[PDB]
Design a protein around this nucleic acid. Structure first.
Ligand code: MG
Ligand code: ZN
Lengths: 66, 54, 251, 288, 1316
DNA sequence: CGTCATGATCATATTATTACGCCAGACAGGG
DNA sequence: CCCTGTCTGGCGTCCTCTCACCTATGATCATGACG
């Protein structure tokens, strides 16, 4: 289901900006989980370009230079 | 503070008369099983000096 | 925070940290001068419960309070839920160069333009007017330009008509439901104090004119003007993204 | 209420009729309040489960898509083929029933001219490429999505479709609500699906299956009526036959589950000991 | 006959039903409840005496001392209401209490006290209520709102369906005390019976039945019948009553008297029961399998062994029968445990019980209350006697005892406030009866189960909580001190009592700030039945059913006036005729329809007495005697409407206005509006604003005079008489002699309230509406208030409206208004803003208010005087200086940027000790001079009335016609006159005169003391300067106007005069609405209001034509009489033949701007009457005039509807919502802009807008929308330099609030970082 | 000159429950 | 150990506007007045 499918992600910032933050941060704390900003909402959090519109061309350039 | 009354009096219902005591030292439903040792050890303490908060 | 009454109604965090430091200093002094055998235990229980009040208040049994019934705020109450850093400060922010007023009709508009007051257009577009003043040479410094546009002399309205001209703004109705709820127009200066908004466009906002209020935003940078012209203009979004039905149905 | 409001707003309404109108009106207002309260949270959960899905390639390179047929509740056809297979890239290339003659190639966006050419030839089921059966790792390719809705052409490489999808589903959540036989209408050939049928003594066709679905194939290939047929129902017709309109072709009992047979012979009792397995209950006022 | 202000402008009245009970005083809930609260009340209850006699006498901890109670008394307040609102104090009265201390001796508490002491003591300050029904808490006029909550008593609810997911319903029986511990009996799906106390842990219910000292034999004696088995020579025979066998299938062949009655395999029919009870069959024969599962009742003991044969409440087996049979017992008592009739719920409950006697039950109850501690028999007895059985901790009220006896079918409605054994046993009996299938459950929303608290009862409860805290202090200082040396004011202190009552009146969830911008808004905020607050439900949790109108709101709570939004149906408003019962329920009037005739006696029915009887509907036709003219009449029996016969009715409604409230009974043609639009119309009629010159409603309901007079905005005459001096400030009435006291000679002075600030920043004015020399009657208006006119209620103004689409400028709901409206200054409302400036006390020294100010020149300081404070009258702009203030740094008060105004009033308050500057001494001399002149004029005016009394007495009995005015006037007593009533009266007037002399001396000294003294103020403030700006806001495109039916709208274009559609007479229409709002939003009442308003103005135009031509009074009398008859059988029936040729000219002077027409709510003017009144004027019959165009000058096809609609300006203006921000201040903890308008803030770019920009491809717009424009401080300073240099470019950076997220997550044990 | 009384200023955390509701997943009760 | 009930954790629209409220009580020390 969509609330369990959104809480079960490989990215703890999305699952923290959604429902319960305590359980998500403790599970990602003891697991040592490592987000890589992976899409839209983590980049809205951290203050950079969305990888959707014009920022999609910017992210293809940034990933090609990796 | 140390008190000694639990035979057939008010075990836990009337702390004192009034004043304003925090509680009955909590630590479980009833007070921690106080044996006959610490009481005798606290019969003549404060064998140091003024110490204080400097 | 001061409340301007000689006293500080403190935040809840300083109360919590103050309780932990009181209880910890009393526990250091009680471990100093020796604990009465089975005694150095109640104080550590109190310290553990004060830290559990600080890290997440209310998760352990009955929470604490300062005044009077409401439980006060720990750290986990600053990260979680609404009124916390994820949903109130980081995903949706308060934004400079913005304003809001009450909407109205004005049917003499083309559908890519909206009426917007002279006072709102003068207060949103201030640094543009400062730049045009010290680029045309009508004020030496920034302070003379600020006092000119505070007095509203007879030349700054020409400056304002020369900065509005090809510069979109974003109009926004307050319950944004779908993506047509934010659109971009080219302003027209209006004597008055309301936002004249094209009628056909109000099919997409679900907006009547019985007291609705809309908010205008300004795109500062150059790429944002191009995105509010090529992607978000009111002439481009004539089809809904839910189907192929037109959204410019005459009401 | 069994005594209705026999007065309109041009005339008056007396006190009780206006009070009953107030029952209805305040029920509606409280519905709208708590309705908005649920609808906003539905939009939130959908844009937070989608949130990430960006059109990130241009061709995945698979074939398996879903099968688009017009929906048939059992009356008029509710949603036709033109309004479902509008603008979505075909999975397997559609061959007209002049078999080994291709009508559309297998990567053609079906815009309005192609949909009219589908409606003319009465195409059965245009198997079409869906987003759920894609192959792109970490995203969704462009051809499996379809037309860029709100525009005309194919979807651009990049437009975040999870967010527009979740808003398009949750946005009409304000408008939503919160709190014997088979009768035919049209005329055509008769189709049966998943049926185990046998011949009775009367000459009809009786059924030994719950999973029977009756269909009405029309003159050009598609289906305009579908009926779930119960277990042990009795048909007045058979498969592949021809009927007329207004003709009830099936009948059963919704109260009784029939235990009808296949072979013709005597009936005996096996592992049926009286007093324990079967009891003696005489029907008193009837006799049988 | 008519009162003299009803001969000014007599309102035309349609309406058919002759009234029998007039509208009561609309503020009777507040005033009657608080009069019930504070009054010297003997016989104990109710009031403050209930608290003072339930918490006192405080007796000590066995120290033989006792602080008992005598009486109480409230002194006068030190400040009257006006000084209290000006200065800012509470409007309180000191509560003096006479307490007594007695101190008993040793060995005899039944012996003599050695010493008593009775004395006066000070405790608390309870705030009084003003005559308007409001409180003044800190200078702001507040209202405490009535609460609707659950009635104390038993309540048998049924948890239907949802539990256990198998359809098996539960049944719980909540006993709701008024004060104490709750008690919930319930079931479970195993059909056991479970008690619980205050939602705590769950126990089996019979554990409390042992706690009331019942043995188990007595419990089964109570809760079951008995079945008798007699062992008489053959198979252990049975006593059988066949009523238990109604439908049971026997296991054998029941025969008796040598006759087969019942066969095996069949059941016992009812006729077989008749056979067995007709033949009187007693003993039948049972097999050995019949008592295989019968449950024994009581204990049987064997006499030989002394052991127990079988325990109580045990099924019987073969060996138990073999044991008790050979022990000598012939009688066996068992129980009847049927499937339908009587389940063994008590028996299964006793089988789950581990307890066995009273002591173990009390131990288990003491253990479920306080967990994990050693019980003792004394502690368990004390706890269980202090849960339910003590006068202290448990108290049903009289309401509670009434519901508890009524819902258990008792007789006496009087009982004790505590429970007993019979009470709990009757609760369990009724719960088992409801489970058995007979009897019904009780719904919640039924208004026989919803009590209404008010101001008096809630203030009593908060005062009682203050008293139990102070008895928790006195039980302290009483047995821990030396006696006798102290007095009972050293013990009891006034801090918890005053803190409790001041916290309740100060900040509660029901003591709320009065919405005061309208007389209607006052009088409908005071009448509010809120469901929220303490003891009730909450908005964001519940629910569905409580937000719905129950069938018994009819005539108690209004169905259509409620706020839409998050709390519909919780903020209910009480109806018009709805009183409050003796206990607290709602009651409403009816007319006792005896067998044929509707008797005109009123008769108040409650909510449960209404259900049993049958009530006729309000508008049923009856022919002059009371005989119902139909033979089927629409009625309602038990919450359900139907059609009944002519003379089975028992009550009729009083008047047809009683379902609605006073908010939604000023709507004309209410029966034509759909209920949603009537709701929105009533709510916006509450939200109006007072205009400059309020006019009148042409189409009213006649309910305007009740709302105007029965509120407190007009100056109602107390004693009638003759006016002597009218002024814009004061009004002097000379009291008539047939209304007048013998002493205290008496001519009344009404000091009107001129321009002052309301709570919603409107302008609460009072204008005198009487002439000079004019007679006034008792109970009559003298001075109109805000939004009143001649004693009526004029909220908005009535304007010429046309329904036509006009070139798109009224597209959705918009309104298009001619410039003729704004030229006439007719919506030009007057607002008043209060701007405060305090002189605080900081370091480097105090502040300066003087005008020697740095950084300023002549152009600022020209509008200030020589001491900083702006003048009174200086018309300022937005951003000048009002008060100049410099700290040890300019911090002068300024007009906030945007508002103009004219400074009308300046207050200066000085903390005592501080040097008064020259302007504070100017205000002190000014107010000394004003109060000096005012009290001297009090003495002069009352002395003039006294000398007029002396002249009136000396007309007879030793009259001196010439000698009276030769001597000075103060000696009119020693003239020639004997010892009569006249020299006695002159001596009494000399007593009054010398009293006025010495009273004037002492009161002028006290008033100089009040002006000269300082005022107690904030900690560390020198002086407070308050300045009142008086803005005059006219009208503009963007304001919100609305009619009285829900037709809202933002006025969209203020056209010129010429563009308006005019008709073939010449007059332009004022407002052009939109027709398309009528068929969807079904408010068809506004079109009937429009047509009847055009009829009213047609009659007004014909009066203006017959009067402008200077015609004699005969033709005016003719036409006014024809316009006042005009209808069916109506109520008005006026005649102008008793107005005498001078009032008719003045009545026509008041009718020339239109003729007011009353239209009551559900008994209004029908269509044919509107047509006949439009035929009296020469208007067209259909109401539609053909209208020309203003632009083209050519005719609109298909003639359009014009008329007059009464439209209201709402105070959602557009220069209070409009806001704009380039770059202002920034918040401190997260570097984002501030929120709001007063704080110069920016609009919240919320979360759904972020989703809507992700939904496009706009990426740079969102990046600057949440990094550059909002948060990143170096990013936004780089942005500001780049914008003023022409380079549109952003240097992004990081949001600083994300660094705040890192510090808050990092301040835990969590280590968040940023890699690479 | 000394003692007593009154007034003013400064100093810390119960004072001596009841009217939401659903879902869900773990913890444990019964068998 | 295999259900099956209980328990306690989560969650419950957006944007804006207005208003109030944010101790008082007790104890100790100092000063003044009276004996
Ligand atoms: Mg609207
Ligand atoms: Zn694909």
């Amino acid at each position: 289901g969509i609330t369990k499918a959104s809480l079960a992600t490989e990215s703890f910032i999305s699952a923290a900006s959604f429902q319960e933050t305590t359980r998500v941060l403790t599970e990602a704390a003891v697991a040592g989980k490592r987000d890589e900003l992976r899409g839209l909402k983590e980049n809205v959090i951290v203050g950079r370009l969305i990888p959707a519109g014009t920022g999609y061309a910017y992210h293809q350039d940034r990933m090609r230079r990796r | 503070l140390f008190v000694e009354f639990d035979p057939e009096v008010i075990h836990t219902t009337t702390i004192n008369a009034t004043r304003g005591v925090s509680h009955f030292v909590r630590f479980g439903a009833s007070p921690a099983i106080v044996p006959s040792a610490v009481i005798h050890q606290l019969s003549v303490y404060k064998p140091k000096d003024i110490v204080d908060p400097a | 925070v001061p409340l301007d009454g000689g006293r500080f109604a403190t935040s809840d965090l300083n109360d919590l940290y103050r309780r932990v430091i009181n209880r910890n200093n009393r526990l250091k002094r009680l471990l100093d001068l020796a604990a009465p055998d089975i005694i150095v235990r109640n104080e550590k229980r109190m310290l553990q419960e004060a830290v559990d009040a600080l890290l997440d208040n209310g998760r352990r049994g009955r929470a604490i309070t300062g005044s009077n019934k409401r439980p006060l705020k720990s750290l986990a109450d600053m990260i979680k839920g609404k009124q916390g850093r994820f949903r109130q400060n980081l995903l949706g922010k308060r934004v400079d160069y913005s304003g809001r007023s009450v909407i109205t009709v004005g049917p003499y508009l083309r559908l890519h333009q909206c009426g917007l007051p002279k006072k709102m257009a003068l207060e949103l577009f201030k640094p543009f007017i400062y730049g045009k003043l010290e680029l045309r040479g009508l004020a030496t410094t920034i302070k003379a330009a600020k006092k000119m546009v505070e007095r509203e002399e007879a030349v700054v309205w020409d400056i304002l008509d020369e900065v509005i001209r090809e510069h979109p703004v974003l109009l926004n109705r307050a319950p944004t439901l779908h993506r047509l709820g934010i659109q971009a127009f080219e302003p027209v200066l209006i004597e008055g104090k309301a936002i004249q908004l094209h009628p056909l466009v109000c099919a997409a906002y679900n907006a009547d004119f019985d007291g609705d209020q809309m908010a205008v935003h300004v795109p500062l940078t150059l790429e944002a003007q191009l995105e509010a012209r090529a992607l978000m203009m009111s002439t481009n979004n004539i089809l809904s993204p839910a189907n192929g039905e037109p959204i410019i149905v005459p009401s | 209420i069994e005594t209705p409001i026999t007065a309109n707003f041009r005339e008056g309404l007396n006190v009780l009729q206006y009070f009953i109108s107030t029952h209805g009106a305040r029920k509606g207002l409280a519905d709208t309040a708590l309705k908005t309260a649920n609808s906003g949270y539905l939009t939130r959960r959908l844009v937070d489960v989608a949130q990430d899905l960006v059109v990130t390639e241009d061709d995945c390179g698979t074939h398996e898509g879903i099968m688009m047929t017009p929906v048939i509740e059992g009356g008029d056809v509710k949603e036709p083929l033109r309004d479902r297979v509008l603008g979505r890239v075909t999975a397997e290339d559609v061959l007209k029933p002049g078999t080994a003659d291709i009508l559309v190639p297998r990567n053609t966006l079906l815009h309005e001219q192609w949909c009219d050419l589908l409606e003319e030839n009465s195409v059965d089921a245009v198997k079409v490429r869906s987003v759920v059966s894609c192959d792109t790792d970490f995203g969704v390719c462009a051809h499996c999505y379809g037309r860029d809705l709100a525009r005309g052409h194919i979807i651009n490489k990049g437009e975040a479709i999870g967010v527009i999808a979740a808003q398009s589903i949750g946005e009409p959540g304000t408008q939503l609500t919160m709190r014997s036989s088979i009768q035919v209408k049209n005329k055509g050939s008769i189709k049966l699906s998943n049926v185990k049928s046998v011949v009775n003594s009367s000459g009809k066709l009786v059924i030994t299956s719950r999973n029977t679905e009756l269909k009405l194939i029309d003159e050009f290939g598609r289906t305009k009526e579908s009926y779930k047929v119960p277990y042990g129902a009795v048909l007045a017709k058979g498969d592949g036959e021809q009927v007329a309109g207004g003709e009830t072709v099936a009948n059963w009992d919704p109260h009784t589950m029939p235990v009808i047979t296949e072979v013709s012979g005597f009936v005996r009792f096996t592992d049926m000991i009286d007093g324990q397995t079967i009891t003696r209950q005489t029907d008193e006022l009837t006799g049988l | 006959v008519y009162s003299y202000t009803e001969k000014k402008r007599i309102r035309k009245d349609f309406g058919k039903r002759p009234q029998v009970l007039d509208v009561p005083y609309l503020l009777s809930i507040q005033l009657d409840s608080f009069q019930k609260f504070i009054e010297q009340d003997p016989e104990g209850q109710y009031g403050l005496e209930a608290a003072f006699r339930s918490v006192f006498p405080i007796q000590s901890y066995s120290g033989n001392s006792e602080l008992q109670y005598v009486s109480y008394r409230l002194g006068e307040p030190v400040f009257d209401v006006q000084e209290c609102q000006i200065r800012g104090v509470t409007y309180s009265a000191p509560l003096r209490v006479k307490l007594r201390l007695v101190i008993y001796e040793r060995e005899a508490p039944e012996g003599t006290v050695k010493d008593i002491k009775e004395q006066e003591v000070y405790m608390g300050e309870i705030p009084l209520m003003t005559d308007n029904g409001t409180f003044v808490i800190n200078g702001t006029e507040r209202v405490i709102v009535s609460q609707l909550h659950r009635s104390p008593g038993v309540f048998f609810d049924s948890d239907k369906g949802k539990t256990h997911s198998s359809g098996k319903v539960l049944y719980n029986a909540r006993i709701i005390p008024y004060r104490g511990s709750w008690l919930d009996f319930e079931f479970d799906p195993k059909d056991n019976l479970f008690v619980r106390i205050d939602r705590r842990r769950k126990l089996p219910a019979t554990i409390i039945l042992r706690a009331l000292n019942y043995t188990t034999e007595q419990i089964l004696d109570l809760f079951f019948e008995k079945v008798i088995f007699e062992i008489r020579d053959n198979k252990l025979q049975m006593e059988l009553v066949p009523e238990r066998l109604r439908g049971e299938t026997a296991s054998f062949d029941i025969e008796a008297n040598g006759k087969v009655y019942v066969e095996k395999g069949r059941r016992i029919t009812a006729r077989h029961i008749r056979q067995l009870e007709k033949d009187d069959v007693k003993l039948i024969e049972v097999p050995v399998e019949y008592i295989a599962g019968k449950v024994v009742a009581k204990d049987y003991i064997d006499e030989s062994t002394g052991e127990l044969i079988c325990a109580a409440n045990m099924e019987l087996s073969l060996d138990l029968l073999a044991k008790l049979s050979q022990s000598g017992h012939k009688r066996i008592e068992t129980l009847f445990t049927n499937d339908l009739d009587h389940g063994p719920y008590i028996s299964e409950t006793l089988r789950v019980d581990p307890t066995n006697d009273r002591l173990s039950a009390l131990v288990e109850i003491y253990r479920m209350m306080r967990p994990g501690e050693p019980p003792t028999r004394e502690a368990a007895e004390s706890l269980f006697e202090n849960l339910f059985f003590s006068e202290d901790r448990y108290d049903l009220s009289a309401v509670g005892r009434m519901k508890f006896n009524r819902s258990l079918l008792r007789e006496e409605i009087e009982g004790s406030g505590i429970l007993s054994k019979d009470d709990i046993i009757d609760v369990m009996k009724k719960l088992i009866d409801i489970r058995n299938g007979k009897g019904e459950v009780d719904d919640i929303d039924h208004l026989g189960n919803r009590r209404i608290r008010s101001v008096g009862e809630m203030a009593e409860n908060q005062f009682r909580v203050g008293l139990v805290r102070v008895e928790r202090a006195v039980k302290e200082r009483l047995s821990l001190g030396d006696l006798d040396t102290l007095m009972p004011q050293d013990m009891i202190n006034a801090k918890p009592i005053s803190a409790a009552v001041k916290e309740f009146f100060g900040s509660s969830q029901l003591s709320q700030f009065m919405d005061q911008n309208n007389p209607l808004s006052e009088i409908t905020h005071k009448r509010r039945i809120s469901a929220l607050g303490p003891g009730g439900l909450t908005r964001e949790r519940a629910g569905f059913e409580v937000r719905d109108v129950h069938p018994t709101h009819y005539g108690r709570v209004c169905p259509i006036e409620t706020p839409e939004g998050p709390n519909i149906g919780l903020i209910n408003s009480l109806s018009v005729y709805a009183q409050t019962n003796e206990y607290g329920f709602l009651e409403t009037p009816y007319r006792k329809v005896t067998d044929g005739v509707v008797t005109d006696e009123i008769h108040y029915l409650s909510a449960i007495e209404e259900g049993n009887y049958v009530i006729a509907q309000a508008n049923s036709n009856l022919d002059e005697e009371g005989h119902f003219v139909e033979d089927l009449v629409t009625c309602r029996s038990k919450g359900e409407s139907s059609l009944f016969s002519r003379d089975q009715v028992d009550y009729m409604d009083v008047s047809t206005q009683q379902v609605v409230s006073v908010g939604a009974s000023l709507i004309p043609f209410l029966e034509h509006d759909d209920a949603n639009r009537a709701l929105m119309g009533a709510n916006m009629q509450r939200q109006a604003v007072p205009t400059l010159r309020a006019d009148k409603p042409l189409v009213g309901t006649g309910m305007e005079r009740a709302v105007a007079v029965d509120s407190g905005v007009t100056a109602v005459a107390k004693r009638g008489g003759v006016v002597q001096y009218v002024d814009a400030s004061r009004i002097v009435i000379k009291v008539n002699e047939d209304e007048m006291y013998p002493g205290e000679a008496g001519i009344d002075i009404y000091n009107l309230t001129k321009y002052t600030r309301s709570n919603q920043n409107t302008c609460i004015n009072q204008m005198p509406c009487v002439s000079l020399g004019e007679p006034v009657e008792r109970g009559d208006v003298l001075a109109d208030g805000p939004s009143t006119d001649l004693g009526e209620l004029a909220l908005g103004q009535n304007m010429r409206v046309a329904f036509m689409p006009w070139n798109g400028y009224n597209f959705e709901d918009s309104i298009l208004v001619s410039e003729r409206v704004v030229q006439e200054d007719r919506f030009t409302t007057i607002h008043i803003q209060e701007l405060a400036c305090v002189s605080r006390d900081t370091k480097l020294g105090p502040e300066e208010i003087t005008a020697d100010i740095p950084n300023v020149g002549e152009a600022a300081l020209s509008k200030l005087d020589e001491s900083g404070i702006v003048y009174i009258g200086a018309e300022v702009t937005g951003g000048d200086i009002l008060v100049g203030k410099v700290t040890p740094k300019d911090s002068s008060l300024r007009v906030p940027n945007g508002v103009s105004g004219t400074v009308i009033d300046v207050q200066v308050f000085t903390r005592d000790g501080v040097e008064k500057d020259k302007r504070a001494l100017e205000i002190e001399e000014m107010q000394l001079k004003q109060a000096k002149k005012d009290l001297s004029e009090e003495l002069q005016i009352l002395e003039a009335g006294l000398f007029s009394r002396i002249r009136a007495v000396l007309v007879a009995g030793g009259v001196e016609a010439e000698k009276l005015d030769k001597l000075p006037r103060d000696r009119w007593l020693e003239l020639g006159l004997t010892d009569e009533e006249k020299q006695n009266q002159l001596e009494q007037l000399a007593e009054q005169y010398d009293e006025l002399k010495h009273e004037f001396e002492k009161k002028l000294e006290a008033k100089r003391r009040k002006i000269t003294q300082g005022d107690d103020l904030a900690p560390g403030v020198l002086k407070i300067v308050k300045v009142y700006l008086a803005v005059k806001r006219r009208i503009q495109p963007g304001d919100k106007m609305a009619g009285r039916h829900g037709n809202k709208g933002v006025i969209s274009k203020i056209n010129p005069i010429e563009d308006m559609p005019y008709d073939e007479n010449g007059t332009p229409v004022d407002i052009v609405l939109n027709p398309l709002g009528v068929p969807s939003r079904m408010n068809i009442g506004q079109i009937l209001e429009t047509h009847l308003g055009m009829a009213a103005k047609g009659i007004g135009d014909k009066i203006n034509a017959m009067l402008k031509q200077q015609q004699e009074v005969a033709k005016l009398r003719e036409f006014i009489q024809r316009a006042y008859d005009l209808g069916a059988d109506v109520r008005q029936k006026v005649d102008l033949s008793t107005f005498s040729d001078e009032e008719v000219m003045r009545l026509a002077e008041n009718l020339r701007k239109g003729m007011p027409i009353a239209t009551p709510v559900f008994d209004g003017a029908k269509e044919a009457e509107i047509k006949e009144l439009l035929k009296l004027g020469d208007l067209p019959t259909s109401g539609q005039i053909r209208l020309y165009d203003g632009r083209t000058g050519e005719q609109f096809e298909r003639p359009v509807t014009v008329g007059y609609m009464y439209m209201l300006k709402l105070n959602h203006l557009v220069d209070d919502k409009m806001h704009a921000r380039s770059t202002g201040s920034y918040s401190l903890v997260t570097q984002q802009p501030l929120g709001g308008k007063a704080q110069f803030g920016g609009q919240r770019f919320g979360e759904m807008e972020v989703w809507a920009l992700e939904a496009y491809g706009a990426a740079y717009t969102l990046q600057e929308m949440l990094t550059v424009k909002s948060d990143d401080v170096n990013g936004r300073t780089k942005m500001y330099k780049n914008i003023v240099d022409g380079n549109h470019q952003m240097e992004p950076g990081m949001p600083e609030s994300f660094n705040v997220l890192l510090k808050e997550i990092r301040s835990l044990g969590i280590n968040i970082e940023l890699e690479d």
